[PDB]
Structure formats: C-alpha cells, structure tokens
UniProtKB/Swiss-Prot annotation:
Induction: Up-regulated in response to low levels of glucose and anoxia-reoxygenation stress. Up-regulated by trichostatin A. Down-regulated in response to high levels of glucose. Down-regulated by histone deacetylation in several tumors. GO terms for molecular function: chromatin binding; DNA-binding transcription factor binding; histone acetyltransferase binding; histone deacetylase activity; histone deacetylase activity, NAD-dependent; histone deacetylase binding; histone H4K16 deacetylase activity, NAD-dependent; NAD+ binding. Binds 1 zinc ion per subunit. Changing S209A: Reduces deacetylase activity. It comes from Homo sapiens. The modification Phosphoserine is found at S46, S137. It catalyses: N(6)-acetyl-L-lysyl-[protein] + NAD(+) + H2O = 2''-O-acetyl-ADP-D-ribose + nicotinamide + L-lysyl-[protein]; N(6)-tetradecanoyl-L-lysyl-[protein] + NAD(+) + H2O = 2''-O-tetradecanoyl-ADP-D-ribose + nicotinamide + L-lysyl-[protein]; N(6)-hexadecanoyl-L-lysyl-[protein] + NAD(+) + H2O = 2''-O-hexadecanoyl-ADP-D-ribose + nicotinamide + L-lysyl-[protein]. Changing Q195A: Reduces binding for the peptide inhibitor S2iL5. This is NAD-dependent protein deacetylase sirtuin-2. The lineage of its organism: Eukaryota, Metazoa, Chordata, Craniata, Vertebrata. The gene is SIRT2. Disulfide bonds: none annotated.
C-alpha cells in the first residue's frame, strides 16, 4: 500500500504524528511498560491460575498475590506518555495485556482501555445472582490479613476481574477491535514481545497504510518461519519502525521530538510525588 512515513525512524513517526493525517492512535502494551515500576513480567522466567481449580482452592492464588504484591502502585514514563496522547486528543484506545492497573492510575479512563486479560482494579462476587463489585482497597486488606475475600451480601468468593485460564476473553476486546481498527492512523506497540494470542494478531488488523512503531528492548512482531507481521529491515519495509531500549527512554525520545518532553517531565514528577505522599 501507500507510504505515509517520509523516513522509517522515530523522527519520521514524530513528523507523521504532527501532520494532519494522524488523528487516532492505538497503543498495544505488555509487561515491558511496567518492569521499571517494580511489576514482574509473568511471561518471563527472570494450574493455580485455572478457573475450575481457583473456585475449589482460592488460597494458593491469594497467597501468591499476598507474596507478589508490588509494594507501591506507581505508573512509568510510558504510562504518562499515553495520558499525554489522551490530553492531546490523539488516543483512540490503549489495548493492554497487563493487570497491574497502572494505566488507570496514570489517568486513562475505562472507555480508553481494552484490558485483554482483565484488571485487579475491580473485584466481583463470583455468584451470578449477586456480582457485588469490590474495589482494590477492599481486596488489598483481604489479601493482607490473609483472610480469604468473601462477599458481605452473600458470603460467596470475591474474585479480582482478571481472566484466569479457562475463562473467555472480554467480549469488549472483539467488539472494540472490529470498530477501532477501521479508524486507526498510528499503531504504537510498547513493552510486548507479541508472543501471546490473540493479542499478537491485533497488529495485522491495522490498515496496510497505517504506520506501526515498536518501542521495546529487543525487536518483535515479525512473522515466525516455524496475514502480515512486522517488516522493519527488508527491502519491502515501508511503514514499520523499531526503537530499541527501555520503553521509558523510547517514549521520552518521542516526546522530545514532538516537543512534549517538559509537559511529560512535569506530569510524571507531579503524579509520582502525589503517589509517594499517600503511600
Ligand atoms: Zn455476593
């Protein structure tokens, strides 16, 4: 298809973003954008999460949650860059594979977000006739005092709104995909190796002309020899660009090219201070 980037660089993406053509940005994000906040990637080595088992034995999962509880919920530069996109009126949607709620704390609203694997921000009574919603504050303590969270109305198990193995993907994902990718002018992929399906396939739902920027420590999204993946390096490459390093440093570099660096700096400092104060 046609070429909208004058150059396959971050500078070329920055100019396209500043041009009249780029109105609607979609962000595809994973564990990589949350590693610098102190949230470990579950897909990295650096049954318990099966739904049938959890309802029978919830203690192991809540014990693991009690242990791997992060200590402080502070969103990174990459999270506040997406809040800047929203402020500038460029954010169509953020598709996240994370469950750490850092997107919402950075100031992305529920309608801005497609949480492909759910979120800890909200919890629900597992009883269909009740489904009493409990916040993260209520859940924290219940995990803290090692007192299994039970519904105050019906005494059923209270589960955080994350998608365990065996659970179906949020219908929101498929419905939003069908609508969002008819409109997207830029695909901003950050902190994901694009190995988990069907999230990885979202990149092929971009129109042929839609530029796609990967900000990651290593390259990813390329078609596996073992329809159309990421093509950065080949002679046919026309729209796909890769920036290699910390997601935070990459977003900071893009913001710098866009003239947002001070606004981003001031936002991250202001919000980090606010969180530090009440934590
Ligand atoms: Zn209930």
């Amino acid at each position: 298809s046609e070429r909208l980037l004058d150059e396959l660089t971050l500078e070329g993406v920055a100019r396209y973003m500043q041009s009249e053509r780029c109105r609607r940005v979609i962000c595809l994000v994973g564990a990589g954008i949350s590693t610098s906040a102190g949230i470990p990637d579950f897909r990295s080595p650096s049954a318990i999460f099966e739904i049938s088992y959890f309802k029978k034995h919830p203690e192991p999962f809540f014990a693991l949650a009690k242990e791997l509880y992060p200590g402080q919920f502070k969103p990174t530069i990459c999270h506040y860059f997406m809040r800047l996109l929203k402020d500038k009126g460029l954010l169509l949607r953020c598709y996240t594979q994370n469950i750490d709620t850092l997107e919402r704390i950075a100031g992305l609203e529920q309608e801005d977000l497609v949480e492909a694997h759910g979120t800890f921000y909200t919890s629900h009574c597992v009883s269909a006739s009740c489904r009493h919603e409990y916040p993260l504050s209520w859940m924290k303590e219940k995990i803290f005092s090692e007192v299994t969270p039970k519904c105050e109305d019906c005494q059923s198990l209270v589960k955080p709104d994350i998608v365990f193995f065996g659970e179906s993907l949020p219908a929101r994902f498929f419905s939003c995909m069908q609508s969002d990718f008819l409109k997207v002018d830029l695909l901003l992929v950050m902190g994901t190796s694009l190995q988990v399906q069907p999230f990885a396939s979202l990149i092929s739902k971009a129109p042929l002309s839609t530029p796609r920027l990967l900000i990651n420590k290593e390259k990813a999204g390329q078609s596996d020899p073992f329809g159309g993946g990421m093509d950065f390096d080949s002679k046919k490459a026309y729209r796909d660009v890769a920036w290699l390093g910390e997601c935070d440093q990459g977003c900071l570099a893009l913001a710098e090219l866009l003239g947002w660096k001070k606004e981003l700096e001031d936002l991250v400092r202001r919000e980090h201070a606010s969180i530090d104060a009440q934590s």
